[PDB]
Amino acid sequence: MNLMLALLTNFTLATLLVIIAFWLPQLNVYSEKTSPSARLPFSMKFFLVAITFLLFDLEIALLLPLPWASQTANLNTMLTMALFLIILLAVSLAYEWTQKGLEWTE
Amino acid sequence: MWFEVLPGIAVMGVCLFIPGMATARIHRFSNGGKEKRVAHYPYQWYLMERDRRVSGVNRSYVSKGLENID
Amino acid sequence: AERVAAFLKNVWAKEPVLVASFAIAGLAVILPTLSPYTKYSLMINRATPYNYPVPLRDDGNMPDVPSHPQDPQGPSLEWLKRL
Amino acid sequence: TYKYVNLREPSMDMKSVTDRAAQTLLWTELIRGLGMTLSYLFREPATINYPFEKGPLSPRFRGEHALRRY
Amino acid sequence: MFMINILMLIIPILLAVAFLTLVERKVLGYMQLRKGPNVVGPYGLLQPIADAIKLFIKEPLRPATSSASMFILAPIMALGLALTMWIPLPMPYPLINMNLGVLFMLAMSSLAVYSILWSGWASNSKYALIGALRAVAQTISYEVTLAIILLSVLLMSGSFTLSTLITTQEQMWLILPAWPLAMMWFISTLAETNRAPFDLTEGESELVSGFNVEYAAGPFALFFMAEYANIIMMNIFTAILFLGTSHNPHMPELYTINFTIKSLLLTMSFLWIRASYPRFRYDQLMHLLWKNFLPLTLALCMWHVSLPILTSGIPPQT
Amino acid sequence: SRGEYVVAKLDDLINWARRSSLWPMTFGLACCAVEMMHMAAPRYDMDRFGVVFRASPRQSDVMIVAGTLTNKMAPALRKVYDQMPEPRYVVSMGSCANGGGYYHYSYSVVRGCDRIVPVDIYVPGCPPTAEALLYGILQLQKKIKREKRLRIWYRR
Amino acid sequence: MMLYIVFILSVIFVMGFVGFSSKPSPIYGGLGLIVSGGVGCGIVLNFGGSFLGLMVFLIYLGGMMVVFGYTTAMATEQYPEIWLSNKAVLGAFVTGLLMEFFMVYYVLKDKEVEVVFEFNGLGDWVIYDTGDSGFFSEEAMGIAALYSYGTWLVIVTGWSLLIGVVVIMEITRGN
Numbered sequence: 013m014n015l016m017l018a019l020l021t022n023f024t025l026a027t028l029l030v031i032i033a034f035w036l037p038q039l040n041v042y043s044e045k046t047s048p049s050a051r052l053p054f055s056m057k058f059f060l061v062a063i064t065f066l067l068f069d070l071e072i073a074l075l076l077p078l079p080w081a082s083q084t085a086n087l088n089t090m091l092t093m094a095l096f097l098i099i100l101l102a103v104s105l106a107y108e109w110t111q112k113g114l115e116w117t118e
Numbered sequence: 119m120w121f122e123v124l125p126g127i128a129v130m131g132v133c134l135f136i137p138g139m140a141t142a143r144i145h146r147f148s149n150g151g152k153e154k155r156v157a158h159y160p161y162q163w164y165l166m167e168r169d170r171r172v173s174g175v176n177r178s179y180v181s182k183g184l185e186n187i188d
Numbered sequence: 189a190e191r192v193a194a195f196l197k198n199v200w201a202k203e204p205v206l207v208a209s210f211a212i213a214g215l216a217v218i219l220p221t222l223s224p225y226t227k228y229s230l231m232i233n234r235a236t237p238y239n240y241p242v243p244l245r246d247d248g249n250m251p252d253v254p255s256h257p258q259d260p261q262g263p264s265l266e267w268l269k270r271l
Numbered sequence: 272t273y274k275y276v277n278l279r280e281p282s283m284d285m286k287s288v289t290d291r292a293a294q295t296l297l298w299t300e301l302i303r304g305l306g307m308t309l310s311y312l313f314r315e316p317a318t319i320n321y322p323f324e325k326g327p328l329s330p331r332f333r334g335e336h337a338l339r340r341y
Numbered sequence: 342m343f344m345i346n347i348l349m350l351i352i353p354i355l356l357a358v359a360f361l362t363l364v365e366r367k368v369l370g371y372m373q374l375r376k377g378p379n380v381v382g383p384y385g386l387l388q389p390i391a392d393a394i395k396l397f398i399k400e401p402l403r404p405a406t407s408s409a410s411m412f413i414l415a416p417i418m419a420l421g422l423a424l425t426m427w428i429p430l431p432m433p434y435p436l437i438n439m440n441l442g443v444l445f446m447l448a449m450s451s452l453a454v455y456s457i458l459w460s461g462w463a464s465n466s467k468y469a470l471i472g473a474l475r476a477v478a479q480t481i482s483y484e485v486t487l488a489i490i491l492l493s494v495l496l497m498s499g500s501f502t503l504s505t506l507i508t509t510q511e512q513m514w515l516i517l518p519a520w521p522l523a524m525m526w527f528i529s530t531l532a533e534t535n536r537a538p539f540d541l542t543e544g545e546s547e548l549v550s551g552f553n554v555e556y557a558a559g560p561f562a563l564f565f566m567a568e569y570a571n572i573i574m575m576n577i578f579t580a581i582l583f584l585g586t587s588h589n590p591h592m593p594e595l596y597t598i599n600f601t602i603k604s605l606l607l608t609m610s611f612l613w614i615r616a617s618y619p620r621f622r623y624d625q626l627m628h629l630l631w632k633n634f635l636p637l638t639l640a641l642c643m644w645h646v647s648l649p650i651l652t653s654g655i656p657p658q659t
Numbered sequence: 660s661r662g663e664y665v666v667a668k669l670d671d672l673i674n675w676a677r678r679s680s681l682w683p684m685t686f687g688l689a690c691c692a693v694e695m696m697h698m699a700a701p702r703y704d705m706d707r708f709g710v711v712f713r714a715s716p717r718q719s720d721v722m723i724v725a726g727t728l729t730n731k732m733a734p735a736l737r738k739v740y741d742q743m744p745e746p747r748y749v750v751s752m753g754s755c756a757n758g759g760g761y762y763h764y765s766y767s768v769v770r771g772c773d774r775i776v777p778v779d780i781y782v783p784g785c786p787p788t789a790e791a792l793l794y795g796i797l798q799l800q801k802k803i804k805r806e807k808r809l810r811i812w813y814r815r
Numbered sequence: 816m817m818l819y820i821v822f823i824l825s826v827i828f829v830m831g832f833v834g835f836s837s838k839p840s841p842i843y844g845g846l847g848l849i850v851s852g853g854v855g856c857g858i859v860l861n862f863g864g865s866f867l868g869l870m871v872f873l874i875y876l877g878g879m880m881v882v883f884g885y886t887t888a889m890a891t892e893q894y895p896e897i898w899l900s901n902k903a904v905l906g907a908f909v910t911g912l913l914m915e916f917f918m919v920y921y922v923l924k925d926k927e928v929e930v931v932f933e934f935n936g937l938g939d940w941v942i943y944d945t946g947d948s949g950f951f952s953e954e955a956m957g958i959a960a961l962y963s964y965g966t967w968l969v970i971v972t973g974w975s976l977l978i979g980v981v982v983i984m985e986i987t988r989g990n
């Protein structure tokens with residue numbers, strides 16, 4: 013219950029601050045002003061950094077249980093598979109690195 | 119001089135100190151002068167529920183000792 | 189050799205971050221197989237009692253199973269106290 | 272007469288290569304820059320308390336015009 | 342009683358943010374051989390109040406937003422998440438004692454990138470959106486090292502419970518066994534919060550950095566408060582993670598005093614760094630993450646998985 | 660507990676906040692911008708008055724016109740002024756911005772920035788000293804202190 | 816009413832789904848999915864899946880959905896049509912909430928409805944387990960076992976992620 017109350021309170025206050033931040037200036041009654049999809053074009057590089065983040069982020073999901081995994085009796089198996097995951101994460105980086113997937117020059 | 123920066127830092131320090139001090143004091147106020155019980159695992163929660171029954175007042179932080187033995 | 193030592197010199201001059209990264213990773217993969225205290229990690233994990241130790245029905249011929257927890261028989265944690 | 276501002280070839284022995292590796296990994300030259308800004312923090316600032324204090328001028332200063340008399 | 346506890350956390354947070362703005366200007370001032378605010382209130386102690394009133398009665402900016410709902414959602418999300426990051430922090434006792442508190446903080450911070458994305462979408466400007474996307478790419482890139490570094494330290498702590506980090510450092514600060522991870526952690530927090538030398542949203546290389554360019558934005562104050570609340574929170578998290586304070590159950594206030602000092606000093610170091618260095622180029626800070634921190638962080642993760650096993654120092658699970 | 664009293668004290672509060680937190684947008688056009696930079700420099704430290712050095716035009720409350728305004732530049736200056744959120748003030752710094760100065764008779768120069776935007780303070784000099792500009796900024800603060808927006812509203 | 820927290824959350828879960836399934840502009844479609852994901856995590860938490868719930872926030876919301884919104888901005892939408900300002904989008908949205916409302920009506924009133932499967936409306940709490948007093952989280956123990964029991968799973972999952980990096984670089988090179 014407490015966590016729900018905390019989240020409700022935090023986002024309730026944030027909401028009130030936002031609306032009063034938008035209403036309080038209307039007290040001034042400032043004068044009227046009367047004076048002012050598709051590609052972006054998007055670079056492929058900015059798409060590829062986002063995708064690389066995602067795939068690296070998925071591999072991090074598999075590594076999060078490591079603190080618990082170290083409590084097992086089969087430590088040799090656990091350590092072998094833990095290093096296997098991190099190494100494949102390094103191999104993903106090495107492949108990206110050596111095919112110029114990490115460059116910003118056009 | 120550089121020590122005229124301290125008054126603003128002192129205000130920051132007091133503001134950051136309050137949440138930690140408040141939580142500790144409110145916890146002891148609400149749990150009979152003791153630390154709020156930590157129940158991260160079912161076994162700990164199971165004992166806390168048992169204490170709430172054993173207390174006779176429906177509060178897990180009311181402890182019954184050998185006075186209840188007979 | 190000396191060709192090998194020269195190559196290690198060029199990377200240590202140009203890519204010290206990667207040299208450190210491969211050195212640290214290499215130790216991570218090698219030292220566990222060489223360490224004598226690795227065996228204790230397995231023993232300690234097996235000495236942690238998460239579950240109740242269900243008693244055995246005493247048929248009458250289990251000499252090495254203690255009848256009471258403080259009897260001499262059964263696995264000891266003397267090695268752990270000293271470690 | 273002229274001097275070169277940037278024409279030094281770094282030495283390539285262990286002692287020197289490892290000194291540069293330490294700088295790269297341990298950020299030593301970056302830490303040095305922090306030392307300089309920390310030293311300034313403890314210096315008296317140069318700010319005068321205008322308008323109670325005024326920047327120095329000289330008799331030649333050219334300001335607002337005026338017509339004079341005998 | 343709990344409702345009092347929440348307000349005794351939220352309100353002081355907003356006051357610390359207010360007066361951090363004064364501390365930043367005075368610390369930056371003295372490192373620049375000047376004073377900073379010392380006229381509005383004694384030693385400038387009223388300057389945060391004058392700025393706050395001034396900003397809230399200022400006229401709202403033009404042009405109009407492209408999406409009203411996203412325009413309003415972004416500041417709510419930024420500030421709502423910023424305050425939420427504080428609820429599991431043990432100081433020494435948390436408001437909410439979570440068994441997975443460290444994971445909660447990772448998860449909530451990964452959601453902070455949405456306010457950047459939504460405010461770029463609601464800016465009604467093609468160039469402002471491109472600026473938001475560069476900021477997002479920076480944020481998520483450095484989230485990778487924060488997660489992996491955090492995982493490496495927890496292999497010495499043994500759980501995801503924030504208050505277990507206190508027990509882990511009862512004898513010694515984790516910065517000694519893990520100073521290489523602390524170095525990269527501290528820089529990642531700078532880059533994560535878009536702080537100098539990683540403050541490219543406030544830099545000179547953005548398509549919208551031109552002074553005469555305009556796009557829908559604001560309110561400025563609410564976004565600013567959210568950002569500075571995260572600066573303090575990250576430095577509080579950094580202290581707990583690497584500079585653990587001893588906790589005496591009978592004198593919790595001593596923990597809080599010592600813990601507050603360490604957080605303040607770390608926060609002041611953010612100001613120290615902003616005064617000392619030039620700004621990274623966008624491609625150079627990407628290179629710093631992907632080609633320096635990440636290879637070394639993966640290697641140190643391998644090391645910290647192996648080290649407890651080979652030394653027989655695996656921490657407890659509970 | 661009259662409405663005149665409350666309106667009077669509320670005016671003082673908002674006036675205090677606005678003058679105590681003046682964020683300038685410096686339009687550094689020519690030489691006068693150098694003296695403006697010496698007003699931010701350590702000796703005078705404009706930031707100590709609450710006047711932040713470099714503020715974006717989106718959050719600025721005052722535009723300082725520091726230099727010659729040419730015809731080719733006049734449209735861009737008016738555009739920045741129109742985009743400033745209110746309340747907004749203009750300080751004209753130096754002879755060129757005040758009335759054309761040395762270049763008053765040029766075919767390419769606007770003869771005073773007050774042909775383009777309304778000006779609140781005129782700072783004379785070529786250039787005004789950093790202290791002269793600071794004097795002018797403090798003069799603007801007192802002009803803001805004298806404002807009576809809420810008193811006038813109450814008597815409408 | 817707090818005793819039906821799971822059911823109430825699952826109603827919001829469906830409403831969010833009707834949100835993005837009526838397919839408004841992709842910008843608001845992502846918003847419906849983000850809310851559904853957050854509610855989805857909430858349902859999993861109330862069954863004792865704390866780690867699983869937080870994975871949704873960290874990986875599904877903080878990872879996958881961030882990338883969706885990133886891609887939407889660059890390649891798809893820059894400004895959206897007003898939500899529910901289109902005939903088909905609004906008609907689909909109204910249709911979904913009517914179906915949800917009637918399912919909720921009959922399940923609560925008759926305490927049971929039947930569509931393909933038989934559903935009981937007593938309350939999701941009635942099926943819970945009545946014995947819990949271990950000194951650990953069973954969910955965490957099962958996930959931790961990935962590295963001891965699940966060697967084969969790690970290999971194929973690890974290989975697929977590596978191949979994903981390779982494949983996506985191939986696809987996007989353009990030559």
Ligand SMILES: CCCCCCCCCCCCCCCCCC(=O)OC[C@H](COP(=O)(O)OCCN)OC(=O)CCCCCCCCCCCCCCCCC
Binds near residue numbers: 296301629637
């Ligand atoms: C017994 C064996 C046990 C096994 C473990 C052994 C490990 C020890 C040996 C490894 C040492 C690891 C050091 C960890 C730091 C990471 C090093 C690093 O990546 O820095 C290099 C990086 C790039 O450097 P650059 O020269 O630009 O280019 C090189 C690439 N071509 O450049 C940088 O990152 C510079 C930093 C950029 C940011 C500058 C602004 C911040 C500077 C001020 C920070 C002050 C210190 C902060 C400390 C905080 C601590 C809480």
Ligand SMILES: CCCCCCCCCCCCCCCCCC(=O)OC[C@H](COP(=O)(O)OCCN)OC(=O)CCCCCCCCCCCCCCCCC
Binds near residue numbers: 305306
């Ligand atoms: C807001 C301000 C708050 C402060 C209040 C006042 C207290 C001040 C305390 C701050 C201390 C730092 C300030 C002094 C730094 C300046 C000293 C210096 O300049 O040393 C430079 C030295 C030489 O560098 P260099 O010339 O390049 O030589 C290279 C080959 N010899 O370079 C070096 O030798 C560097 C050696 C250290 C390298 C360490 C690398 C980083 C490791 C991170 C560990 C962080 C541990 C401390 C974190 C805090 C926890 C206690």
Ligand SMILES: CCCCCCCCCCCCO[C@@H]1O[C@H](CO)[C@@H](O[C@H]2O[C@H](CO)[C@@H](O)[C@H](O)[C@H]2O)[C@H](O)[C@H]1O
Binds near residue numbers: 358362543
């Ligand atoms: C109860 C608390 C209520 C909230 C109160 C919030 C008060 C905010 C006071 C801010 C004080 C000024 O602080 C200063 O502001 C300017 C923004 O103009 C920042 O300036 C920075 O961002 C802007 C863009 O946003 C850049 O144009 C500028 O180059 C950069 O330096 C400074 O980094 C900051 O140090």
Ligand code: SF4
Binds near residue numbers: 726752754756
């Ligand atoms: S007024 Fe004088 S100093 Fe200023 S821009 Fe004109 S010529 Fe230069």
